[model samples]
Target chain A: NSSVLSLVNFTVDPQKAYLDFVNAGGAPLTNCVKMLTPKTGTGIAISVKPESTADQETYGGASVCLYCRAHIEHPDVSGVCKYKGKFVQIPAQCVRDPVGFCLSNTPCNVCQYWIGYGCNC
Target chain B: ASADWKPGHAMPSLFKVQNVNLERCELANYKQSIPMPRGVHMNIAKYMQLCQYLNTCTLAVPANMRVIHFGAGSDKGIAPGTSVLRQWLPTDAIIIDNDLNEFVSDADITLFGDCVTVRVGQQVDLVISDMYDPTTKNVTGSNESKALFFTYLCNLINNNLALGGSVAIKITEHSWSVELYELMGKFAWWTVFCTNANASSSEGFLLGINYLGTIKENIDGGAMHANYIFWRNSTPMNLSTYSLFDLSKFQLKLKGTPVLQLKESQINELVISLLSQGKLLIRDNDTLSVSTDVL
Candidate 1:
């Protein structure tokens, strides 16, 4: 498997809409960053168009069903990876704090649950 | 008589000017764009102090270390704010800035755009940044969202920081996390915010690896004196909920190269996990808020 793994980089398609890393929380978390190398597949063995089930709609429950959720490792974070299907379950803590609960409810887009249980559902 | 004048209790302090090595902390004389007249971002003393702390508290930079600078504005904003790591005898270094012309004369392999995006293929001994603000605003892609800036940085540390390695940054108190501890507690288990003697304000950021190395067995979910906490609105944070407290700074040794690669939304999820408990997380166009816990 290691032999098939090739390192790759990514570019945020300026046309498709993106969130500036610097603006998210106060002064961009990038101001003070660290690396979290959790064990996961970073190679896109079989890349396909993203599928959304959780939040298939956007506009925070306000709009007329627009695409809301996105595939985590699609390209935004900029990494090369595979379909390990290791996404985990949602945590109760995620459903806390008005902010946390609102964030957790991303509209349930395509689940891509091809493997087994949902990842970070 | 002395008992009547009980020793005054002052806020927890960072580098003691009296204790700093005059030579290193005195680099204000170097002529440059951002002249550090007295402990400016480029002050040598700040770097020396950080150098000693990193060397002693965490892994010691043997020699010829490699450092990554984000927004290496006009040289290093290029503290891009990790001056200590820069002048600490690292033989190799790289810079990333929006403006290519900002690259310095000695610049080597400087990349344009997010220093983090360039980080996809490699991992270094240290990752440092400064001159990053939430208010100024920047639009990189077709989408008009500054949200990515925060996510990119979230991905940077969540993706790039080499395990057992170290990082230093400069933080502005405006829109940036507002409170210090809540912001840092995200990825790093052992984080310390400091102010340089020159600026007389928070100018230095030092941290321990989030690796939870066996070295940090004694970390206490990260509770400390209130001097460092930037009490915005005077709201209090329950130091007890800081479950990760016990995993504070301990001896962390440098190891194999740090791998900062993740899948599609992997980095996104990671960043959301550390939303500072309160800072507002906007997913689509709506401001993140719940009916039950609306802030």
Candidate 2:
């Protein structure tokens, strides 16, 4: 007589898949104040330079991730740079300047999560 | 919040009440004995004389007397004698001021209107008129206007004052002031002219004591009448004379009662000190002239 009445469980997807889902690339993605522009070539679905190397000659006029493990300094002028496999215009002050490899090893106070320009960490 | 501030809060305990009284305010100290006038106190000398007179007089005033304070401006809220009167006798006071904003007091009632025409409900024991206007300081076209004010005040006293009531009015110093003083004497038993140390030399007060009726009875049995005749028949009293008890010019009774002759009192230093030192000259033809320099 005391059993509580059950109401409809109005959910769209299966419960197990919803609970099992994990965001490997982080839950939500947002661009930095300086890197948000069409010149970044749609951050998704664009070719970007990957794979770090030692004693390699700089790829002239190419861009690297500010957050990824890569070292590039004094490169030639490039019209566009890469952000997570997409082209982003480099700021005039940062052009051909020492760029990134900000992780726990290198460390960065600007973007602590290492999710910044070029390849998404 | 600090312990050092604890005893500082009790610092006010050092203070005590002050019971202050002035040298002139001493009971036994009469005029000549008090401090003589030298500076600003000299101007208001007459107020001291009046105070001495009121303090020493044996006149009977009711415990709860009514006082009408007319034309009392706000700058000096209460009249000069209000405190003195309270010191000796308790009184119920009412004030009338046309410029209502200037004078404020805790009188029994405060009437907002001119002294000339304001309605007073009951007969009062004393009427004090302090109507010294800005024009009073200007002697040229001023005395005439002040005379008109006095005329109305005379009417006010006649209509509102009770039997044996008193009057104190500010009068500009001039020859015509004597004539007004004469008129005041007609309605009172005795009239005195005095000035205050706090007031200018150009100003004086005409005080009427013992209000006789509009149709005064010959209670002094023609003594006042005979004295008036004596005053008019002879030369004017010396310049230092202050009180004129027999100065009225009422016509003598053609037939009747025997009039007693009494000599006037000698010069009183207390009363004489408060007199305004104005230049008054009575000509050979009985015409009066006051010096324009000191009008």
- Models 1 onward score TM values of 0.37, 0.37
Q: Evaluate model 1 with DockQ and give the value.
A: 0.01
Tens-digit per-residue lDDT, B173-207, candidate 2? 32123334454544434433333222213233455
TM-score of 1: 0.37
The regions of model 1 sitting more than 4 angstroms off are A1-121, B1-49, B60-64, B75-86, B92-101, B105-107, B114-117, B134-148, B178-189, B202-206, B213-227, B230-295
lDDT (tens digit, per residue) of candidate 1 on B1-295: 3211211112223411112211211122221232332212333333333443454443424223345555544432222223233323333333222322233211233455444345334444455555455443442432121232445554555544444345565542321322223334443344553422223333336353433112323322213212233321122111111111121221123322223333334545343333212111212221111111112
Off by over 4 Å in 2: A1-121, B1-49, B56-60, B74-81, B91-101, B141-146, B174-180, B195-200, B214-295
